[PDB]
Amino acid sequence: KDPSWASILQGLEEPYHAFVERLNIALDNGLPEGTPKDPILRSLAYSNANKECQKLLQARGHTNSPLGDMLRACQTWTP
């Protein structure tokens, strides 16, 4: 059963921060005790982002950057 949080995908018109927030909440609830959240969150923030935000993140070299940088990068994107 793939972790419920691994299936969280950014919607087509969902702002990136809203998506990251849902992801963050899911990880808080679903990660076993002692599992590092931050590296998982960063990885998923990129890999589960919609195509537009993924492009922005790639273009800026933020495919594994701190979450703050990823948030700033996708802010320019408004559905």
Author numbering: 1 to 79
From the paper:
The retroviral structural protein Gag forms the immature protein shell of nascent virus particles. All retroviral Gag proteins contain three canonical domains: matrix (MA), capsid (CA), consisting of independently folded N-terminal (CA-NTD) and C-terminal (CA-CTD) domains, and nucleocapsid (NC). During immature virus particle formation, these domains function in membrane binding, viral lattice self-assembly and viral genomic RNA (vgRNA) packaging, respectively. Our results show that HTLV-1 uses a distinct CA-NTD arrangement to form the immature Gag lattice and that, in contrast to other retroviral structures, the CA-NTD is the key determinant of immature HTLV-1 assembly.
To gain insight into the immature architecture of HTLV-1, we used cryo-ET to visualize mammalian cell-derived Gag-based VLPs. However, to account for the observed heterogeneity of HTLV-1 Gag VLP shapes, we applied local C2 symmetry during subtomogram averaging. The resulting maps had a CA-CTD layer that was resolved to a lower resolution than the CA-NTD layer, which we predict is because of heterogeneity caused by flexibility of the CA-CTD. Three-dimensional (3D) classification focused on the CA-CTD yielded a class in which all helices were resolved. Therefore, we used both domains as independent species in a multiparticle refinement using the software M34. This approach yielded 5.9-Å and 6.2-Å resolution maps of the CA-NTD and CA-CTD layers, respectively. Within the CA-CTD layer, the only intermolecular contact is a dimerization interface formed by helix 8. Unlike other retroviruses, where the CA-CTD forms interhexameric and intrahexameric contacts, the CA-CTD of HTLV-1 only forms interhexameric contacts. The positioning of the individual HTLV-1 CA-CTD dimers places them out of reach of the adjacent dimers around the hexameric CA ring, not enabling them to contribute to intrahexamerization interfaces forming a lattice. The positions of individual dimers are constrained only by the flexible linker between CA-NTD and CA-CTD.
